[PDB]
């Protein structure tokens, strides 16, 4: 802890808050979390060092002093929420789209093969650096552990659904694809219903047709109003044939149906992607 000369604070987390932090010692410049200890939470959050990946923001040192428990990660200069305030007058060429979607999609395959979710993406949770590269960071806290924002939380979640997938994280990708393309929030609620209608509004109230067990969900009710589909066209208006085609699939409410990160890093729209750098202001 007295390791560590705090420079600037980065934001309150949902496990605590975070500060940008040079390491007295080496003099590296970190990303330090303080949380705020079970075993369970010691020993899971061990297995996370363990994960290493060009597209996971790696957890350098777990230190559990005092009675306390500070993270220490690699540190990038900007996340994906600030980037797309800075480009909201042209919005992120589709180029950069299709890099960073790609990107966050070997990243989640990578996980996902190791069993660990991220449970909460957002925007806030992505950062990028000047090389072009984009980084998953915050992987594994949630079961590490146990306003918050709902825009990208899965309809099974909302549901009651308690055992969720990496299904999950599919979908919350799927709907900060759609944010970067329109420049928008796809689903912004305010509360848990309004979520869920919001949702409802835009994919059509889900049956047992679309979604078996649908109906059994602890949270679902009979008396949910019922909303016709609407046309992806319209809801992502500039996106092409090949990229709509694949958010409808990271989109589709049936957890079992939607697409694994794995099947969506083979589909068309990767096809013609590649690396390109992008303009940041730090
Ligand atoms: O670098 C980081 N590693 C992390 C691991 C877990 C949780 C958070 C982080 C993390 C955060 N970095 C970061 C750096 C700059 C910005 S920003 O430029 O977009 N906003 C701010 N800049 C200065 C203070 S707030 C946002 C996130």
Redesign the pocket.
């Given at each position: 802890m007295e390791n560590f000369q705090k420079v600037?604070?980065?934001?309150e987390?949902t496990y605590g808050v975070?500060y940008?932090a040079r390491n007295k010692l080496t003099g590296e410049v970190?990303?330090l979390?303080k949380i705020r200890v079970p075993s369970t939470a010691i020993r899971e959050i061990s297995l996370l060092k363990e994960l290493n990946h060009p597209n996971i923001?790696k957890?350098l040192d777990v230190i559990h002093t005092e009675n306390k428990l500070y993270?220490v990660?690699?540190?990038?200069?900007?996340?994906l929420?600030?980037?797309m305030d800075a480009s909201a007058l042209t919005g992120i060429p589709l180029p950069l789209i299709k890099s960073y979607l790609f990107q966050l999609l070997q990243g989640l395959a990578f996980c996902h093969s190791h069993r660990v979710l991220h449970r909460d993406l957002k925007p806030?949770?992505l950062?990028i650096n000047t090389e072009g590269a984009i980084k998953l960071?915050?992987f594994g806290?949630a079961r590490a552990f146990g306003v918050v924002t709902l825009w990208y939380r899965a309809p099974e979640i909302l549901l009651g659904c308690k055992y969720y997938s990496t299904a999950v994280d599919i979908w919350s990708l799927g709907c900060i694809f759609a944010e970067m393309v329109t420049r928008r929030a796809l689903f912004p609620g305010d509360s848990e219903i309004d979520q869920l209608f919001r949702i409802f509004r835009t994919l059509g109230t889900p049956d047992e047709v679309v979604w078996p067990g649908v109906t059994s969900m602890p949270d679902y009710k009979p008396s949910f109003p019922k909303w016709a589909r609407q046309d992806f066209s319209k809801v992502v208006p500039p996106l092409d044939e090949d990229g709509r085609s694949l958010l409808s699939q990271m989109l589709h409410y049936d957890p079992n149906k939607r697409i694994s990160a794995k099947a969506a890093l083979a589909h068309p729209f990767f096809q013609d992607v590649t690396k390109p750098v992008p303009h940041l202001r730090?």
């Open positions: 600037e604070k980065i934001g987390g975070v940008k970190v990303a979390k923001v957890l993270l990660f690699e540190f990038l200069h900007q996340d929420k600030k980037f806030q949770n950062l960071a915050d806290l730090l």
